[PDB]
A paper describes a structure:
Here we describe the development of helical concave scaffolds tailored to the convex target sites typically involved in immune receptor interactions. We employed these scaffolds to design proteins that bind to TGFβRII, CTLA-4, and PD-L1, achieving low nanomolar to picomolar affinities and potent biological activity following experimental optimization. We focused on five-helix bundle scaffolds, with three helices forming the concave interface and two providing structural support. We reasoned that a set of concave helical scaffolds with shapes tailored to interact with a wide range of convex Ig fold-containing targets could provide starting points for the design of high-stability and affinity binders to immunotherapy targets.
We further optimized the most enriched design, 5HCS_TGFBR2_0, by resampling the sequences of interfacial residues in the bound state using ProteinMPNN25 and filtering the complex models using Alphafold220. Four of the most enriched optimized binders obtained after several rounds of yeast display selection were produced in E. coli. The highest affinity binder, 5HCS_TGFBR2_1, was found using biolayer interferometry to have an affinity less than 1 nM for TGFβRII. We determined the co-crystal structures of 5HCS_TGFBR2_1 with TGFβRII. The high resolution (1.24 Å) X-ray crystal structure is very close to the computational design model (Fig. 2c; root mean square deviation (rmsd) over Cα atoms of 0.55 Å over the full complex), showing 5HCS_TGFBR2_1 binds to the TGF-β3 binding site on TGFβRII utilizing the concave surface as designed. Helices H1, H3, and H5 which form the concave binding surface interact with TGFβRII, and the most highly conserved non-core residues are in these helices. In H1, N10 hydrogen bonds with TGFβRII D142; in H3, S46 and S49 hydrogen bond to the backbone atoms of strand S72 - S75; and in H5, N93 hydrogen bonds to the backbone atoms of I76. A hydrophobic patch composed of F48, L50, and I76 on TGFβRII critical for TGF-β3 binding packs tightly on a hydrophobic groove formed by L6 from H1, M50, V52, K53 from H3 and V96, K99, V100 from H5. All the key interactions described above are recapitulated in the crystal structure with high side-chain orientation consistency. Design of such extended grooves and pockets is nearly impossible using small globular miniproteins; the high affinity binding and crystal structure of 5HCS_TGFBR2_1 demonstrates that 5HCS scaffolds can indeed be used to target convex binding sites. Dose-dependent inhibition of the TGFβ SMAD2/3 signaling was observed with an IC50 of 30.6 nM.
Numbering used by the authors:
A (entry chain A): 23 to 123
B (entry chain B): 45 to 155
The structure:
């Protein structure tokens, strides 16, 4: 499902289809909340990467700020966990978002 | 200002990829790259029976494992062999999102 959403997201970005982007962003945010609440942090980071791109494209600063907040929560958890690639990824995503939120 | 690539970024992981035309990375972490110029990279290594797959972002201005990135502009991760004593080593770089999730050793052809 997520591979197809990414494909559709990029098709829409490339073609200027802002309505599709906004729809996909809404779906990603729902998927993100579910992954986060299940403690599936690798999946949450992954979804968040995509959501950040979609929210950036449509200029949705409020969503970017929400994504920064959830990423910071993920970081707080992973600081304690010893999965270095996941911790580095959440931190990398935070630095990218901080440019736009 | 360019939004960075999204790449698989699990660093070095054990892998089951062997004797296959293509492999999925089985990396559960898609990260945004830090820097806009970075591309996705996959490195497949087999030393005796130990197979690893490395997934990262990397700036193609720089070598990686002391090799120059080839056709980093391609959207697809086309694996190519490098000379490395004592092991089999293949690498690819690519510039489309999650492109280092789909590692290509050979294509399928309609005949």
């Amino acid at each position: 499902g997520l591979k197809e959403l990414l494909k559709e997201l990029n098709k829409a970005i490339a073609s200027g289809d802002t309505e599709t982007v906004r729809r996909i962003l809404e779906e990603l945010l729902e998927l993100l909340k579910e992954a986060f609440e299940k403690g599936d942090y690798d999946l949450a980071i992954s979804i968040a990467s995509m959501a950040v791109k979609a929210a950036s494209y449509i200029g949705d600063t409020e969503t970017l700020k929400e994504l920064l907040e959830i990423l910071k929560k993920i970081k707080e958890k992973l600081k304690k966990e010893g999965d270095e690639a996941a911790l580095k990824a959440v931190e990398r995503n935070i630095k990218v978002v901080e440019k736009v939120a | 200002m360019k939004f960075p690539q999204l790449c698989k970024f699990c660093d070095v992981r054990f892998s089951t990829c062997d004797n296959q035309k293509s492999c999925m990375s089985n990396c559960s972490i898609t990260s945004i790259c830090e820097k806009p110029q970075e591309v996705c990279v996959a490195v497949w290594r087999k030393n005796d029976e130990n197979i690893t797959l490395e997934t990262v972002c990397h700036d193609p201005k720089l070598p990686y494992h002391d090799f120059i990135l080839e056709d980093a502009a391609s959207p697809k991760c086309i694996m190519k062999e490098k000379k490395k004593p004592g092991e089999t080593f293949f690498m690819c770089s690519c510039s489309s999102d999650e492109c280092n999730d789909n590692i290509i050793f050979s294509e399928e052809y309609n005949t």
